[PDB]
Design a protein around this ligand. Structure first.
Ligand SMILES: Nc1ncnc2c1ncn2[C@@H]1O[C@@H]2COP(=O)(O)O[C@H]2[C@H]1O
Length: 935
């Protein structure tokens, strides 16, 4: 079989995942299909994880039902997986304690510059020691975290695999009465949506007790540095949760109410795509055009506000680290204290460390735990039932449809004004600090130094809001513009384009792709741009001090550019395996629950369990590879992110004779913030490039085949049509079914027809309506058919379709979408349709629209509706093709004023002493005056 190198692996290779390099060399130029992914360990099999849990659950239910109590399943889970988390808590504690020690030893290097003496070498070795203690913490947070992460991630798949085994073992025991309650849907949902929530709980289970401790420690450390002023920064940090919950509650409403306007549009588009052969023939396009335009306009108007709310939230997240500092330090200065550089950046780091993680990870954990407990309760109640006895081109085409390039220039110039202020706000504080120390009581005026600080605080927020708003608007206008082109292009396509593409594909397109364009793209773009600009500022601040740091930057910048590729070229193949191995288990389960009686007939159910386990092991292998490959890259990245910090610190120390304390503090406080932002920036690009495929495939339309125009230059002013040796063909080079369509049907001669099945009887109607322009010409009452627009031709003809169709609407719009008749004229139209009793029995009697795809009626009255359409139209030429009968027969024989009927039917006896009759050959005709000659 396939041995996996996870075992047979020394230490120092599991920290860096050195056992995973060969695979890449193989996936670099071969596209591994299925036989190159290793098998799982012997302690991660379903048959091994689903037995101990079953035993513990049996023991627990026994101990519970023994007494007058209620049994629980959340106790049997902790009886098995308690040592694992007990051991992981040691490391999560060791890790949460290293983020509080960095700022303590950061403030000890700056104090060496505040108290500096060249002729002193005993006070410098202590500085080197302090700096050496500051690197082990980075190496702990950067290298030893990923093994722990992989383990805490693997701790969830075990539970997810243990639950499904017992769920299936139970489902194979349901009785007749018990299975009549729950059907296939719920049983497959228990595995497709519920168990899939245990993978994220273990990641967000340690914050519940690690957030408060961190906050308390941080505030206690702050008290010893500045004093009571610290409170002024912890108040602004708690108001954010109340101020952000309400706006989310408000946003959900907007979303819910726009979903309604979306669904109706989708339904209208669906019912429009099915029946094009009738709309294109009756000339009823503008109605649906307007019906879609109105709904799209409403949807956009409702989406703008939600997008604006999201942009405001992002801006708030961008500039919340400035208000806290501003408030706390203006208070600290007004109370009467003096400002130094060893107290400022320490507090900056403490804040930046606590606020983000706590306010962004404490709320999510609660939702995760709640959902997990709900799913556990569902599973518990279920387990108790009874039992038996791309490219730059796409980006350029997606951006230039939003606004003129001057707007893009303004946007580029507006995004590089927020970061400048973000950095200048701290440079000003370092400048103040350095100006304080050069005094001898020669006090500093606070008006100037405080007003400039306030102004630099205000500009940041203003620009950060403006940027987000403009970006969102520009990226929504692009979808607004593309959807139109899409619709007004697919509406003018031939019928052949629809005979090769099923409705499902086009509907899925119109729904999913536009949803992605309108919902997610702008937010991801904005977050990616923001996090990208947040890194260039760090690097530029680190270069403007110690200019020599530009030399070791060009190599670390070239390595990454390659590494990423060397990774993706095998990472774009694991998702395919995951999906292809996850679908068959669900298929097998769904098809296995129905054929159950035979499985019970023969006492053989041990094989199906083994087959299920074998099906699940493949997905287990794929998940293992996914986790390992995701962790193989972060270590390589963090190595560089930490080498940068080491270089900065030791270079600052080696050059302690040409720079001051404020500058080194500013450079160091930013270098301790690069890892997470770089990770997020590299993570967002994946999603961006993944969802840009929707944009790539949407633009595939907007340029397709296009039939002749609807209106030519020269307008037109008994239907005597004359034919010739013309020939007709569906495709330009397909087979041929009609040859030399030669015949003449002059003034109101009631033509007939007689034909067989498949010998080309339903083709001339497609040529008369020029659904596919054939070779040759056909004269009609002094004018041709190709020298006239499509609408000027398809409007002067009436057809009785074989399959009746009624659209969602009233009996007034479905029979007269264009307002040109009066009400009494419609009543007279429906006077001779033999159907006027049903209408009046309803409230409006003509305006009570119907639903359920017209299921309220049947073929009979629907064909009556079609005949009513034909009558109300009052045209000269008429083409009837049918394949109640007495009603239609007699009434059409009576009403129509003997105007050039063309009847087509499969029953020859439908003719009763007609005027002129024909037969069908395989493409030609055998006819003369009347059939009595031969017959
Ligand atoms: N909404 C978010 N979800 C996850 N990670 C984020 C988010 N926003 C920013 N990040 C980054 O992800 C990092 C995860 O670890 P840190 O808390 O050290 O710092 C975090 C940020 O750099």
């Amino acid at each position: 079989v396939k041995p996996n190198p996870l075992q047979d692996a020394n230490l120092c290779s599991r920290v860096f995942f050195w056992w995973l390099n060969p695979l890449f060399k193989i996936g670099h130029k071969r596209r591994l299909e299925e036989d190159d992914m290793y098998s799982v360990l012997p302690e991660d099999r379903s048959q091994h994880l689903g037995e101990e849990l079953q035993g513990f659950w049996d023991k627990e239910v026994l101990r519970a039902e023994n007494d007058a109590q209620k049994p629980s399943l959340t106790r049997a889970i902790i009886k098995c997986y308690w040592k694992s988390y007990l051991v992981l808590g040691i490391f999560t504690l060791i890790e949460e304690s290293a983020k509080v020690i960095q700022p303590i030893f950061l403030g000890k290097i700056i104090n060496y510059f505040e108290n500096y003496d060249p002729m002193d070498s005993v006070a410098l070795n202590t500085a080197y020691a302090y700096a050496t203690v500051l690197t082990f913490c980075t190496l702990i947070l950067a290298i030893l975290h990923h093994l722990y992460f992989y383990h805490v991630q693997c701790a969830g798949m075990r539970l997810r695999v243990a639950m499904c085994h017992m769920i299936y073992r139970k489902a194979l025991r349901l009785s007749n009465m018990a299975m009549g309650k729950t059907t296939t849907g719920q049983i497959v949902n228990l595995l497709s949506n519920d168990v899939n929530k245990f993978d994220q709980v273990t990641v967000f289970l340690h914050f519940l007790w690690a957030g408060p401790l961190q906050a308390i420690a941080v505030t206690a450390l702050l008290w010893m540095e500045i004093g009571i002023s610290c409170l002024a920064g912890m108040a602004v940090l708690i108001i954010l949760l109340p101020l952000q919950s309400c706006f989310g509650k408000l946003f959900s409403s907007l979303r819910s109410k726009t979903a309604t306007f979306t669904d109706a549009r989708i339904r209208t588009m669906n019912e429009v795509i099915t029946g094009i052969r009738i709309i294109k023939m009756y000339a009823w396009e503008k109605s649906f055009s307007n019906l879609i335009t109105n709904l799209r306009k409403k949807e956009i108007s409702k989406i703008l506000r939600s997008s604006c709310l999201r942009g405001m939230n992002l801006a708030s997240f961008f500039s919340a680290s400035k208000i806290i500092v501003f408030v706390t330090f203006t208070t600290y200065v007004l109370l009467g204290s003096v400002i130094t550089a060893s107290r400022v950046f320490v507090a900056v780091t403490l804040y930046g460390a606590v606020r983000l993680t706590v306010t962004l990870f404490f709320p999510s954990a609660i939702e995760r735990v709640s959902e997990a407990i709900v799913s556990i309760r569902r599973i518990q109640t279920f387990l108790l039932l009874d039992e038996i006895s791309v490219g730059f081109q796409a980006y350029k085409n997606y951006f230039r449809a939003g606004a003129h390039w001057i707007v893009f220039i303004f946007l580029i110039l507006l995004n590089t004004a927020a970061q400048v202020a973000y950095v200048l706000q701290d440079w000003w504080l370092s400048y103040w600090a350095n100006k304080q120390s050069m005094l001898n009581t020669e006090k500093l005026d606070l008006n100037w130094y405080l007003g400039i600080y306030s102004g630099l605080t205000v500009a940041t927020v203003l620009f950060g809001i403006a940027r987000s708003l403009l970006v969102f608007y520009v990226l929504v206008n692009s979808s607004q513009t593309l959807h139109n082109k899409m619709f007004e292009s697919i509406l003018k396509a031939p019928v052949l384009f629809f005979d090769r593409n099923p409705i499902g594909r086009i509907l899925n397109r119109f729904s999913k792709d536009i949803g992605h364009l309108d919902d997610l793209l702008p937010l991801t773009f904005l977050d990616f741009i923001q996090t990208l600009l947040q890194v260039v500022g760090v690097v530029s601040v680190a270069v403007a001090v110690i200019p020599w740091i530009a030399i070791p930057l060009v190599p670390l910048g070239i390595i990454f550019i390659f590494l990423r590729r060397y990774f993706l070229e095998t990472s774009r193949d694991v998702k395919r395996l995951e999906s292809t191995t996850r679908s068959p288990v669900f298929s097998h389960l769904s098809s296995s629950l129905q054929g159950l009686w035979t499985i019970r007939a023969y006492k053989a159910e041990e094989r199906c369990q083994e087959l299920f386990d074998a099906h699940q092991d493949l997905h287990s292998e794929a998940w293992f590879l996914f986790l390992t490959t995701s962790r193989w890259f972060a270590v390589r990245l963090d190595a560089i992110c930490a080498m940068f910090v080491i270089i900065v610190a030791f270079g600052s120390l080696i050059l302690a004779k040409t720079l001051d304390a404020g500058q080194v503090g500013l450079a160091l406080s930013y270098a301790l913030t690069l890892m997470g932002m770089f990770q997020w920036c590299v993570r967002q690009s994946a999603e961006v490039e993944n969802m840009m495929i929707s944009v790539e495939r949407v633009i595939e339309y907007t340029d397709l085949e296009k039939e002749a125009p609807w209106e030519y230059q020269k307008r037109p002013p008994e239907g005597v049509i004359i034919f010739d040796n013309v020939n007709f063909m569906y495709s330009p080079g397909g087979p041929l079914v009609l040859k030399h369509l030669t015949a003449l049907i002059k003034s109101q001669e009631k033509v007939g027809i007689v034909g067989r099945t498949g010998a080309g009887k339903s083709s001339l109607i497609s040529a008369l309506f020029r659904l596919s322009e054939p070779e040759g010409k056909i004269w009609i009452d002094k004018i041709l058919t190709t020298e006239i627009g499509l609408h000027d031709l398809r409007k002067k003809m009436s057809i009785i379709p074989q399959e009746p169709v009624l659209f969602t609407g009233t009996m007034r719009k479905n029979l007269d979408p264009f307002n040109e008749h009066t009400d009494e004229e419609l009543w007279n139209a429906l006077q001779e349709v033999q159907l006027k009793e049903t209408i009046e029995d309803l409230p409006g009697k003509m305006d009570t629209e119907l639903a359920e795809s017209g299921s309220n009626f049947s073929v009979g009255q629907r064909q009556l509706v079609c005949l009513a359409r034909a009558i109300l139209r009052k045209n000269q030429i008429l083409i009837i093709d049918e394949a109640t009968d007495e009603l239609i027969q007699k009434k059409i024989r009576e009403k129509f004023a003997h105007c050039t009927v063309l009847t087509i039917a499969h029953r020859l006896n439908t003719i009763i002493d007609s005027d002129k009759i024909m037969v069908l050959d395989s493409g030609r005709l055998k006819e003369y005056d009347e059939p009595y000659v031969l017959l």
